[PDB]
Amino acid sequence: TYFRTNKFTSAFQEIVDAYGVAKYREANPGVFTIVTFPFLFAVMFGDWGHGICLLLGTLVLIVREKKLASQKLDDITDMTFGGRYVILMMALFSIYTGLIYNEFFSVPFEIFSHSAYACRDLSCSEATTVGLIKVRDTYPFGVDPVWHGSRSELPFLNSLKMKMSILLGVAQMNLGIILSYFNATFFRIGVNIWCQFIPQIIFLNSLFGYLSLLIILKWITGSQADLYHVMIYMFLSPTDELGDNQLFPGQKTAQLVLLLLAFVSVPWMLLPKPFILKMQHHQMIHTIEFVLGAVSNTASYLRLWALSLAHSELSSVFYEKVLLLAWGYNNILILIVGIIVFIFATVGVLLVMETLSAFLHALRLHWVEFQNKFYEGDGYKFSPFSFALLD
């Protein structure tokens, strides 16, 4: 059986079908993914200019779908016709994503003030100074351009982006665990749910949450020299003792206790369910599956960070080419030729290549997250006696 799908729901249903099937009682996160995959893809990458233009083109296609119904699409156009709603939602999310990134039309733009971020004091001192720049005013709608888009601000900004992606992956894992718990409640197991899902969930969740809370505490304390590597430095010693950099006064003993708790819970993820089954009367796949899934979530976060960095680099390259064309063209013709060439190249790179790569990566991350979460394939589609030509 299949849940009824509207015009917008059809793409999510198709995605769920790609991720195998699920039982009628089995939870189907397809509706949730219909926003999550746009939510992740927006976090993954996005260009404000072409993305808005791509969204406008998709909306025009949706408006003209009446003719597109008559005019049979070809190859990827057919898939686009079905996925118009999902693409529009993804572009809408990417709009806010670019707003956060502040690279409007793949270029930083001032927000509210004449300059969104500036350098307080150091009037004569160069940007490469001890005082350097002070952001007395910070951009309220997006990252401060001085602190992010500037020449030397790139490394710290990238580290912060990677750290945030780690937290986003932790949140995705938590959502998967929550979905698993909900589906188990739907499965209505008297004690098997507590014996199996509760230990499999929560354990790795808190394992990653320790690092996420460490990141939050670092953001509160604002340590500088370690940059985003303070967490790496802290976790570098799984053994006890030391822990000088620990922001929480008791973070060391608490971390040791948490490590012991995780070590104890590790068999609890695998042992209770087969024991209950034997008492009534796979786990081997579940073995190492938790570590593999945590590694996969970290990989997804790193992939998102890398995709964002690559998008920023491509935007910088396009802006540099445009600036070079404009500055070195006293005559109108040279500037026009350069602008046209740069526009064509940037469109091809971003709207096609970068967009497809980001979509594929986001889809793969979504499949990994869903497979970790639930629904384990194992089903088929609703089978009516519908006339294919008529319907």
Binding site: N158, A225, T298, L302, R303, W367
Partner: protein, 156 residues
Amino acid sequence: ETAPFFGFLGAAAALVFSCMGAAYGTAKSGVGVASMGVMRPELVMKSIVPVVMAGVLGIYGLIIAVIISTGINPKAKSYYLFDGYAHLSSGLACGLAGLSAGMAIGIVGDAGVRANAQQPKLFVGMILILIFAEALALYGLIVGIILSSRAGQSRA
């Protein structure tokens, strides 16, 4: 004082080896998909996956290269001698991991494209194999990041 030459060499080598591995994997996957073509035209979605994995590996390599290049700042904390060799080690590790991942991904993608024509029920297994392969590249990127982390401490 001569360390920055080694650092720049390692930074370039990381990207070069990652690109070579990605290119090999992509070529293998494309040949396999073209072979799978015509017989299974509907398998375009399946054939897209190995190209996505190769692109992900290439992006990871570029990210590692960018991180390494950012690490090289002679203006503050003079590179001394440990910085260049550390950058070279990180770049070499990243490049080797990328090449290995690219070769494995290309072989597995060729096998999957071959399996695409008949019995498409193994698409889930093929995707699982591809993800397990890309796990190696992810681990290599993590190792490169960890190595780049220790670079600052050596300045003292």
